[PDB]
Design a protein around this ligand. Structure first.
Ligand SMILES: C[n+]1cn([C@@H]2O[C@H](COP(=O)(O)OP(=O)(O)OP(=O)(O)O)[C@@H](O)[C@H]2O)c2nc(N)[nH]c(=O)c21
Lengths: 181, 36
Protein backbone atom coordinates (compact mmCIF):
# COMPACT_ATOMS: atom_id res chain seq x y z
CA UNK A 1 0.00 0.00 0.00
CA UNK A 2 2.83 2.41 0.85
CA UNK A 3 4.87 3.38 -2.22
CA UNK A 4 8.46 4.32 -1.43
CA UNK A 5 10.24 7.19 -3.15
CA UNK A 6 13.13 5.88 -5.28
CA UNK A 7 16.48 7.63 -5.27
CA UNK A 8 18.32 8.42 -8.49
CA UNK A 9 21.19 6.24 -7.24
CA UNK A 10 21.76 3.24 -5.00
CA UNK A 11 23.87 4.25 -2.00
CA UNK A 12 25.96 2.17 0.39
CA UNK A 13 26.84 3.14 3.95
CA UNK A 14 30.33 2.26 5.15
CA UNK A 15 31.59 2.47 8.74
CA UNK A 16 35.33 2.46 9.40
CA UNK A 17 36.50 1.52 12.89
CA UNK A 18 40.18 2.05 13.60
CA UNK A 19 41.83 -1.34 14.15
CA UNK A 20 45.60 -1.40 13.66
CA UNK A 21 45.53 -5.21 13.53
CA UNK A 22 43.85 -4.82 10.11
CA UNK A 23 44.79 -2.99 6.95
CA UNK A 24 42.95 0.28 6.38
CA UNK A 25 40.76 -1.32 3.71
CA UNK A 26 39.75 -4.07 6.15
CA UNK A 27 38.74 -1.40 8.68
CA UNK A 28 35.89 -0.46 6.31
CA UNK A 29 32.62 -2.25 7.12
CA UNK A 30 29.86 -2.32 4.51
CA UNK A 31 26.61 -1.82 6.44
CA UNK A 32 23.70 -1.69 4.02
CA UNK A 33 22.64 -0.34 0.65
CA UNK A 34 19.43 1.57 0.00
CA UNK A 35 17.69 3.05 -3.02
CA UNK A 36 14.67 4.86 -1.54
CA UNK A 37 14.16 7.80 0.79
CA UNK A 38 12.31 5.61 3.29
CA UNK A 39 15.05 2.97 3.35
CA UNK A 40 17.68 5.66 3.91
CA UNK A 41 15.74 6.87 6.94
CA UNK A 42 15.25 3.31 8.20
CA UNK A 43 19.05 3.12 8.19
CA UNK A 44 19.95 6.57 9.53
CA UNK A 45 17.26 6.59 12.22
CA UNK A 46 18.79 3.57 13.98
CA UNK A 47 22.55 4.17 13.71
CA UNK A 48 24.65 6.37 15.96
CA UNK A 49 25.03 9.96 14.71
CA UNK A 50 28.62 11.02 13.96
CA UNK A 51 28.85 12.76 17.34
CA UNK A 52 28.53 9.37 19.08
CA UNK A 53 30.76 6.99 17.10
CA UNK A 54 34.24 6.08 18.33
CA UNK A 55 37.13 8.45 17.75
CA UNK A 56 39.06 7.30 14.70
CA UNK A 57 35.90 6.03 13.01
CA UNK A 58 34.44 7.15 9.69
CA UNK A 59 31.02 7.15 8.12
CA UNK A 60 31.06 6.97 4.33
CA UNK A 61 28.08 7.10 1.97
CA UNK A 62 29.09 6.25 -1.60
CA UNK A 63 27.15 5.25 -4.68
CA UNK A 64 26.81 1.48 -4.90
CA UNK A 65 29.90 -0.31 -6.25
CA UNK A 66 32.12 2.74 -5.49
CA UNK A 67 34.37 1.89 -2.57
CA UNK A 68 35.22 4.83 -0.17
CA UNK A 69 38.91 4.78 -1.05
CA UNK A 70 41.45 6.30 -3.41
CA UNK A 71 42.15 2.98 -5.14
CA UNK A 72 38.64 2.66 -6.57
CA UNK A 73 38.60 3.49 -10.27
CA UNK A 74 35.75 5.96 -9.72
CA UNK A 75 37.97 7.92 -7.29
CA UNK A 76 41.46 7.57 -8.82
CA UNK A 77 41.16 10.72 -10.97
CA UNK A 78 38.97 12.47 -8.39
CA UNK A 79 39.27 14.76 -5.40
CA UNK A 80 37.33 15.78 -2.28
CA UNK A 81 35.73 18.96 -0.94
CA UNK A 82 37.09 18.95 2.61
CA UNK A 83 35.22 20.76 5.39
CA UNK A 84 37.41 20.94 8.47
CA UNK A 85 35.06 21.73 11.35
CA UNK A 86 36.10 24.16 14.09
CA UNK A 87 35.00 22.08 17.06
CA UNK A 88 31.28 22.75 16.75
CA UNK A 89 28.63 21.26 19.02
CA UNK A 90 27.39 17.71 18.56
CA UNK A 91 24.08 18.74 16.99
CA UNK A 92 25.78 21.12 14.56
CA UNK A 93 28.11 18.26 13.63
CA UNK A 94 25.30 15.74 13.17
CA UNK A 95 23.05 18.20 11.34
CA UNK A 96 25.88 19.07 8.95
CA UNK A 97 26.58 15.41 8.15
CA UNK A 98 22.89 14.65 7.63
CA UNK A 99 22.46 17.70 5.39
CA UNK A 100 25.42 16.41 3.36
CA UNK A 101 23.77 13.00 3.10
CA UNK A 102 20.52 14.65 2.01
CA UNK A 103 22.42 16.60 -0.64
CA UNK A 104 23.82 13.32 -1.97
CA UNK A 105 20.72 11.11 -2.02
CA UNK A 106 18.52 14.04 -3.02
CA UNK A 107 20.70 14.76 -6.06
CA UNK A 108 21.02 18.45 -5.23
CA UNK A 109 24.02 19.07 -7.53
CA UNK A 110 23.88 19.92 -11.22
CA UNK A 111 26.90 17.64 -11.69
CA UNK A 112 25.44 14.97 -9.41
CA UNK A 113 26.89 12.39 -11.81
CA UNK A 114 30.32 13.58 -10.63
CA UNK A 115 29.47 12.85 -6.98
CA UNK A 116 31.02 9.64 -5.69
CA UNK A 117 30.20 9.88 -2.00
CA UNK A 118 30.95 11.63 1.27
CA UNK A 119 33.12 10.84 4.28
CA UNK A 120 33.01 12.19 7.83
CA UNK A 121 36.09 11.61 9.99
CA UNK A 122 35.50 11.63 13.75
CA UNK A 123 38.84 12.46 15.37
CA UNK A 124 40.19 13.91 18.59
CA UNK A 125 41.72 17.17 17.38
CA UNK A 126 39.05 18.09 14.83
CA UNK A 127 36.33 16.47 12.76
CA UNK A 128 36.24 16.48 8.97
CA UNK A 129 33.50 16.14 6.34
CA UNK A 130 34.47 15.47 2.73
CA UNK A 131 32.51 15.07 -0.51
CA UNK A 132 34.36 12.93 -3.05
CA UNK A 133 33.97 13.82 -6.73
CA UNK A 134 35.00 11.76 -9.73
CA UNK A 135 37.22 14.07 -11.83
CA UNK A 136 39.50 16.62 -10.19
CA UNK A 137 40.41 18.05 -13.60
CA UNK A 138 36.72 18.92 -14.11
CA UNK A 139 36.96 22.45 -12.73
CA UNK A 140 33.40 23.23 -13.86
CA UNK A 141 31.97 20.36 -11.80
CA UNK A 142 34.26 20.87 -8.80
CA UNK A 143 33.32 24.55 -8.46
CA UNK A 144 29.60 23.94 -9.06
CA UNK A 145 29.57 21.29 -6.32
CA UNK A 146 31.69 23.55 -4.13
CA UNK A 147 29.47 26.59 -4.62
CA UNK A 148 26.36 24.44 -4.17
CA UNK A 149 27.81 23.00 -0.97
CA UNK A 150 28.37 26.29 0.84
CA UNK A 151 24.89 27.30 -0.37
CA UNK A 152 22.93 24.19 0.66
CA UNK A 153 25.00 24.13 3.87
CA UNK A 154 24.88 27.09 6.23
CA UNK A 155 27.54 29.60 5.22
CA UNK A 156 30.26 29.50 7.85
CA UNK A 157 32.65 32.40 8.27
CA UNK A 158 34.59 29.99 10.48
CA UNK A 159 34.72 26.84 8.32
CA UNK A 160 35.96 27.01 4.72
CA UNK A 161 36.00 24.67 1.74
CA UNK A 162 39.19 22.98 0.55
CA UNK A 163 39.31 20.83 -2.59
CA UNK A 164 42.19 18.33 -2.55
CA UNK A 165 42.98 15.94 -5.39
CA UNK A 166 43.14 12.29 -4.36
CA UNK A 167 46.29 11.93 -6.47
CA UNK A 168 47.94 14.39 -4.05
CA UNK A 169 46.66 13.41 -0.60
CA UNK A 170 47.46 9.79 -1.50
CA UNK A 171 51.18 10.59 -1.83
CA UNK A 172 51.46 12.73 1.32
CA UNK A 173 50.77 10.44 4.27
CA UNK A 174 50.88 18.71 4.64
CA UNK A 175 48.48 18.54 1.67
CA UNK A 176 47.84 21.27 -0.90
CA UNK A 177 44.42 22.74 -1.67
CA UNK A 178 43.65 23.33 -5.36
CA UNK A 179 40.47 25.32 -4.64
CA UNK A 180 39.16 27.39 -1.73
CA UNK A 181 35.55 28.55 -1.39
CA UNK B 1 3.27 13.80 11.49
CA UNK B 2 3.34 14.50 7.76
CA UNK B 3 0.70 12.63 5.76
CA UNK B 4 1.54 10.89 2.49
CA UNK B 5 -1.57 12.32 0.84
CA UNK B 6 -0.42 15.94 1.36
CA UNK B 7 3.24 15.60 0.36
CA UNK B 8 3.86 18.30 -2.22
CA UNK B 9 5.73 17.42 -5.41
CA UNK B 10 7.35 19.97 -7.69
CA UNK B 11 6.60 19.97 -11.40
CA UNK B 12 8.62 17.33 -13.23
CA UNK B 13 9.63 15.70 -9.94
CA UNK B 14 9.09 12.01 -9.31
CA UNK B 15 5.87 11.27 -7.43
CA UNK B 16 3.71 8.16 -6.90
CA UNK B 17 1.54 9.65 -9.65
CA UNK B 18 4.47 10.65 -11.91
CA UNK B 19 6.94 7.76 -12.27
CA UNK B 20 8.76 9.60 -15.08
CA UNK B 21 9.61 12.64 -12.96
CA UNK B 22 13.15 13.42 -11.90
CA UNK B 23 14.23 11.46 -8.83
CA UNK B 24 15.48 14.62 -7.12
CA UNK B 25 14.38 15.62 -3.61
CA UNK B 26 14.90 18.85 -1.69
CA UNK B 27 16.20 18.77 1.87
CA UNK B 28 12.81 19.66 3.36
CA UNK B 29 11.16 16.98 1.20
CA UNK B 30 13.47 14.26 2.51
CA UNK B 31 12.95 15.39 6.11
CA UNK B 32 9.21 15.37 5.42
CA UNK B 33 9.35 11.69 4.43
CA UNK B 34 11.37 10.75 7.52
CA UNK B 35 8.09 9.88 9.26
CA UNK B 36 6.13 6.87 8.00
C1 LIG C 1 41.18 7.73 2.78
N1 LIG C 1 42.28 6.82 3.14
C2 LIG C 1 42.95 6.86 4.27
N2 LIG C 1 43.86 5.89 4.29
C3 LIG C 1 44.79 5.61 5.40
O1 LIG C 1 44.44 6.44 6.49
C4 LIG C 1 45.37 7.53 6.60
C5 LIG C 1 44.62 8.84 6.63
O2 LIG C 1 43.53 8.73 7.58
P1 LIG C 1 42.13 9.49 7.33
O3 LIG C 1 42.04 10.19 6.03
O4 LIG C 1 41.02 8.46 7.42
O5 LIG C 1 41.95 10.53 8.52
P2 LIG C 1 42.99 11.41 9.35
O6 LIG C 1 42.30 12.56 9.98
O7 LIG C 1 43.62 10.53 10.43
O8 LIG C 1 44.14 11.92 8.38
P3 LIG C 1 45.43 12.81 8.64
O9 LIG C 1 44.93 14.20 9.00
O10 LIG C 1 46.31 12.80 7.44
O11 LIG C 1 46.11 12.22 9.88
C6 LIG C 1 46.34 7.40 5.43
O12 LIG C 1 47.65 7.77 5.84
C7 LIG C 1 46.25 5.91 5.08
O13 LIG C 1 47.12 5.12 5.88
C8 LIG C 1 43.77 5.19 3.11
N3 LIG C 1 44.53 4.13 2.76
C9 LIG C 1 44.22 3.66 1.56
N4 LIG C 1 44.89 2.61 1.08
N5 LIG C 1 43.24 4.18 0.76
C10 LIG C 1 42.43 5.26 1.08
O14 LIG C 1 41.58 5.67 0.30
C11 LIG C 1 42.77 5.77 2.37
Amino acid sequence: PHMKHPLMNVWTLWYLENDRSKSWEDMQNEITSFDTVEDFWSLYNHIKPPSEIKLGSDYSLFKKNIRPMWEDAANKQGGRWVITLNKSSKTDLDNLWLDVLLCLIGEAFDHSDQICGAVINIRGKSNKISIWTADGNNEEAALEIGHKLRDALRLGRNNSLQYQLHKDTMVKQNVKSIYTL
Amino acid sequence: GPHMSIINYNEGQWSPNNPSGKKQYDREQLLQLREV
